Ligand binder design. Structure first.
Ligand SMILES: C[C@H](O)CC(=O)OP(=O)(O)OC[C@H]1O[C@@H](n2cnc3c(N)ncnc32)[C@H](O)[C@@H]1O
Ligand SMILES: C[C@H](O)CC(=O)OP(=O)(O)OC[C@H]1O[C@@H](n2cnc3c(N)ncnc32)[C@H](O)[C@@H]1O
Lengths: 474, 474
């Protein structure tokens, strides 16, 4: 194959740095013919499954139950059809019966390097070798975004249980960038951060797309201009936004920089296994030789053809601790296999990830993702930057209830101008989704902003009824 | 000398682990005759000063101004008398004139690994080699606290600009412990942490002494018992507490574990250069071959005899990036040179560090440190766990104004019992300090707790006058 440092268990040269003129960290692995890579992926898949059968009674029990033995993995078609998907509920049960890390940990207790998790929570017990595998994978993909040694990288996501921040930091460290782990979560942090970004002038920023928006309002409230932060790029994970039309454009305009989309799941660190590149800057590429991504039909867990929508199912190819083999994301995406501007021979998620299938709600037989509402509103000049979707999953909904913020300039323009925006927001959303949308305007900057993931859906039956009844009276 | 890995610039074997039966990480460096170590320290001091003269125009300019050349460093007595102390104000000025890291950075820009700082803030630009020097120094000292490979270490301090959390994490990583960087700072964290500590059962905890107290109230509010967290120890830095009589005893009782004191300054990472050991568990030892600590008379910056109080002045012996040479802490301590129970041949701070000299206030010609008030109150069964000291530095104070919380059981006992506590708190404080103390009781759990450093002094002239006038009327 000629694939750079292709071995299981993986063991990367910590001193390797690509030549300054190279677009790719690993030219072979990244640009080789896709059919050549798929051969080696299957080869690795066999190694991983044999490794899990040997060290994980979770996989040994699960596979035996579905009638699977690693010797039956003889093609990628055998993998999708014979190998049962892992659910997050299966991990929880394994952790409850085999505490703290479950019967899929594989490595001895003495190998565990870092303890992280979800916020029943699942604990991540990551071995020393996996932490190195994650740092190398992430430095590689960050290089793909045009981030370089010596660049100041601001990691502005909470450093706690959450894998996002640690993963971007490990990549920055391995990339030989100046890692700036400012973090997030504490009151007073954002006001101080904007001063640090104005002083330090970083080449790159990491966090959630929501935080980047909130930080520009803080920069402006703090009489600082966020275009003067010297940013060449901002790269995000954690939620949709970075591949959302009006959201991506708002962030790139506010900072005068490029926006990159990345991120699968925390269970799937190196989570940057799905990430956009400097040239293929829309959506994300599936870095197949790091983690094998399958976009599947949720009805049978088999790959959907390219150009079709489905759910990402992921498999670690370079992890010995808590390896995930065919973990069901529960997310919705579309994947294609056409030529990429960067020249990387990987499948792509051209519109990134739409959201979690469970987050979707139905109004008059029409399926709606919260990200579709966020996209339509952000493409409006009069929109204030925040909204809430008020629903009920207990009874059928005839209309969409929205609490939308107008801009301070729309507010300053008077009652008639506010009313003109409320009606135009309602119409736009109706034209986009094909559903009746009731809009209630709230005061500018009244809706809570976040430095983490935006939770815009209020699924309470009493809140829904109170709002509908109030909107019927007005 | 036979000192393990004694070299400048330092370059530690990342695979070294002491034998399981050893009390010391480095038997020679830690237990050698003090006069033998002081010879090699002076030798290193010469190397460091030559290194700074060559790479830092900040030190070249400062030393030339004080009439000092590194060739004049011919004894430890030459060091204290000839070498001018560095002030935090000098670092700020150097950073403003030579942004971002100042003219004392020494290493090239390309060597900077991590960016941290203070919260005018000073930026820390720490090189890759220094980060390794810090991780090794900290693993060594944590081993001294009886912390071992495979032990689950909860790092519960904010992961941001602040060096404390990163320093404990780097030590845990190098110690081959299971590093658990939960962090601090965000609302909802403490309630979730107590659940993680009950589930995970860590051998060690890191944070501020204030946070450990707050976390026990959260554990109890959450109907969990903090003695059931499996803790063998809690080790703290950031503020006094861990060497404060009633505070140390309250924490050890609440958790059923040992408490260790550590920590100099963030500018002085590896900040654990002052730290207690499993056997010398009261106060802190000065790990002289890591950082050279001098307890000086603030009037002349010369060492005070053992058994006398003074200000810690620190010098890095194993740092190439932003090396600190005779940095004035502005803190107050007492140092002695008697035999230590662990058998380490180091000077000791038997009562740790009392506080920042600037934090001290005067009432009727009597000098008081906020930690003396904290100590007296914490040694009272009826004390609720929080208080505020209300002062004025604008006019002379005749009496001490205190806002003290009683316990919920003292409150439930009625008005007479609350009044009996208010008078007894006043008397105790008067007997301790020798000053009139006016006590106002506040509602139990009304005073804000913290996961960081406790700021108990309110130095406002209007607040002081309002309180005195209110206390004169009652
Ligand atoms: C540790 C990383 O930050 C990823 C992460 O947030 O892990 P979590 O377990 O906390 O959450 C994963 C879920 O967030 C979403 N999710 C994560 N990244 C997404 C993206 N780029 N686009 C659309 N949705 C995305 C997506 O629904 C994914 O399944
Ligand atoms: C990065 C480390 O946590 C140390 C730290 O907090 O660095 P900072 O620069 O943020 O603050 C240093 C000051 O906190 C105090 N300070 C720090 N540790 C102390 C202790 N153990 N006992 C008494 N006072 C102590 C002491 O006054 C010291 O000068």
């Amino acid at each position: 194959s000629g694939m750079e440092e292709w071995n299981f268990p993986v063991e990367y040269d910590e001193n390797y740095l690509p030549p300054a003129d190279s677009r790719y960290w690993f030219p072979r692995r990244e640009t080789m013919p896709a059919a050549e890579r798929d051969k080696a992926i299957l080869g690795r898949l066999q190694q991983v499954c044999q490794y899990a059968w040997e060290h994980a009674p979770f996989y040994r029990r699960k596979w035996e139950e579905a009638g699977f033995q690693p010797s039956q993995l003889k093609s990628l078609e055998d993998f999708e059809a014979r190998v049962p998907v892992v659910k997050k509920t299966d991990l929880r049960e394994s952790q409850a019966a085999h505490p703290p890390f479950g019967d899929y940990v594989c490595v001895p207790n003495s190998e565990i390097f870092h303890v992280h998790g979800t916020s029943r929570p699942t604990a991540f017990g990551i071995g020393r070798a996996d932490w190195r595998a994650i740092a190398n994978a992430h430095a590689r993909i960050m290089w793909g975004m045009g981030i370089r040694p010596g660049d100041l990288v601001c990691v502005a996501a909470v450093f706690s249980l959450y894998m996002g921040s640690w993963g971007a930091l490990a990549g920055a460290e391995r990339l030989r960038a100046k890692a700036f782990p400012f973090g997030a979560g504490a009151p007073g942090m954002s006001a101080r951060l904007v001063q640090w970004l104005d002083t330090m002038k970083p080449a790159a920023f990491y966090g959630t797309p929501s935080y980047a928006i909130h930080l520009a309002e803080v920069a402006r409230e703090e009489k600082l201009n966020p275009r003067n932060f010297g940013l060449k790029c901002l790269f995000f994970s954690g939620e949709p936004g970075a591949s959302v039309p009006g959201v991506k454009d708002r962030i790139e305009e506010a900072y005068g920089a490029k926006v990159y989309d990345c991120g699968s799941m925390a269970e799937m660190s190196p989570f940057m296994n799905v990430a956009g590149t400097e040239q293929s800057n829309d959506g994300m590429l599936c870095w197949q030789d790091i983690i094998y991504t399958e976009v599947c039909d949720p009805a049978n867990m088999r790959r959907v053809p390219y150009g079709q929508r489905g759910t990402p199912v992921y498999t670690h190819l370079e992890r010995t601790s808590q390896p995930m083999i065919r973990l069901l994301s529960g997310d919705l995406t579309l994947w294609t296999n056409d030529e990429n501007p960067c020249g990387r021979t990987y499948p792509r998620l051209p519109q990134g990830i739409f959201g979690r299938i469970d987050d979707m709600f139905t109004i008059r037989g029409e399926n709606i993702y919260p990200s579709e509402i966020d996209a339509a509103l952000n493409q409006m000049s009069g929109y204030g930057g925040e909204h809430r979707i008020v629903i009920t999953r207990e009874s059928a909904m005839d209309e969409l209830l929205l609490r939308v913020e107008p801009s301070e300039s729309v507010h300053a323009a008077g009652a008639a101008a506010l009313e003109t925006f409320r009606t135009e927001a309602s119409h736009r959303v109706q034209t986009v989704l094909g559903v009746r949308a009731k809009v209630e305007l709230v005061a500018p900057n009244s809706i809570a902003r976040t430095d983490f993931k935006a939770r815009r859906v209020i699924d309470d039956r009493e809140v829904f009824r109170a709002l509908n009844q109030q909107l019927q009276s007005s």
